[PDB]
């Protein structure tokens, strides 16, 4: 399956994608 | 004859053995002299002719300071403090030269065999760098690429381990007596059981279990030691044991003759 729910371990990849997009200095930069 | 000694295992670099019919102060003093007063040779003073790397120079110096050398004939030479001369005569010190170049497109390494003997070696087997791997390489110093130059004049004098760990040959020790708590000098911490909350000693089998119910032996005394000494390999392990014995005995003989002078 690909349509399964999401274990608590998994969300670090979401954090990876979010930081690779925004960056830390995103507030000042935006 | 008194202090009987028995070997367990030997190699090129570590010796584990049995010391019996001896005393606790004798063993402790043996350890202390074994880590403290074994004279050898190592690099001490450095002359940077020209540096170009991305490292700095006294960093390279302290990096150099820990390279051990050949140490057989170290008794033959003399301390610079007691030597009549000034500035590193051939009797009291040795000279080291290192050369590297930025030749290749890729990165370049410097191994500790690349340093060479310079001055008069006068036939005494002294000051070669120790190789341990299969591939001829004394341990790494610095990395360079295509543009950087190092010219190193270095002078190595005597030194001892007690003022700085540069001249320490020991760099490991092991120490055991009463593996089975028969002398009962300390208890064990426990939360529900003394036995299962602790592992057995590896030295367990050479002394019997404590018979489980006999009264506390009061007039027993410490003996039956377990010494495993693993030297650095700058000097062989038999030589460091017999030389630690030798410097302990010469120290005690020195204080005895000073007393009879007084």
């Amino acid at each position: 399956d690909e349509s399964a729910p999401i274990t608590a371990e998994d969300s670090w990849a979401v954090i990876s994608a979010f930081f690779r997009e925004k960056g830390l200095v995103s507030q000042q930069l935006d | 004859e008194g202090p009987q000694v028995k070997i367990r295992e030997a190699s090129k670099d570590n010796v584990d053995f049995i010391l019996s019919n001896v005393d606790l102060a004798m063993a402790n003093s043996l350890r202390r002299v074994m880590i403290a007063e074994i004279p050898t040779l190592a690099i001490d003073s450095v002359e940077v002719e020209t540096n170009t790397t991305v490292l700095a120079d006294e960093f390279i110096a302290h990096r150099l300071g820990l390279i051990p050398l050949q140490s057989m004939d170290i008794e033959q030479l003399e301390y610079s403090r007691d030597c009549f001369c000034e500035d590193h005569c051939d009797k009291c010190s040795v000279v080291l030269t290192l050369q590297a170049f930025g030749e290749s497109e890729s990165t370049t390494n410097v191994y500790s065999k690349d340093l060479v003997i310079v001055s008069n070696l006068m036939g005494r087997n002294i000051g070669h760098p120790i190789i341990q791997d299969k591939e001829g390489n004394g341990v790494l110093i610095c990395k360079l690429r295509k543009g950087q130059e190092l010219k190193l004049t270095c002078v190595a004098k005597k030194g001892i381990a007690k003022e700085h760990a540069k001249w320490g040959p020991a760099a490991a020790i092991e120490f055991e007596y009463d593996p089975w708590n028969k002398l009962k000098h300390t208890d064990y911490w426990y939360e529900q059981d003394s036995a299962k909350e602790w592992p057995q000693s590896k030295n367990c089998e050479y002394e019997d279990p404590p018979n489980e119910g006999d009264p506390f032996d009061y007039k027993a005394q410490a003996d039956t030691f377990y010494m495993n000494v693993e030297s650095v390999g700058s000097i062989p392990v038999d030589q460091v044991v017999v030389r630690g014995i030798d410097t302990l005995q010469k120290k005690v003989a020195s204080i005895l003759l000073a007393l009879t002078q007084m």
Binding site: - | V54, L55, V139, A165, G168, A171, A172, V232, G233
Partner: protein
Amino acid sequence: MIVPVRCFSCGKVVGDKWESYLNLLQEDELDEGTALSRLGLKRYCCRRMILTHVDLIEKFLRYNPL
């Protein structure tokens, strides 16, 4: 940075097995625990040194000064 010399805990010569410890990952696909086993530091006191060293000298030297 540079993997250092003579472990604070034990004190034996450390860094002989360094690029060895490197090349037992890539062309062997070898797990680090058995890789440290075969590497042969039976204490842990030196095992940690290579475990938590982080290279910096590569990122240092891939400048081009002078």
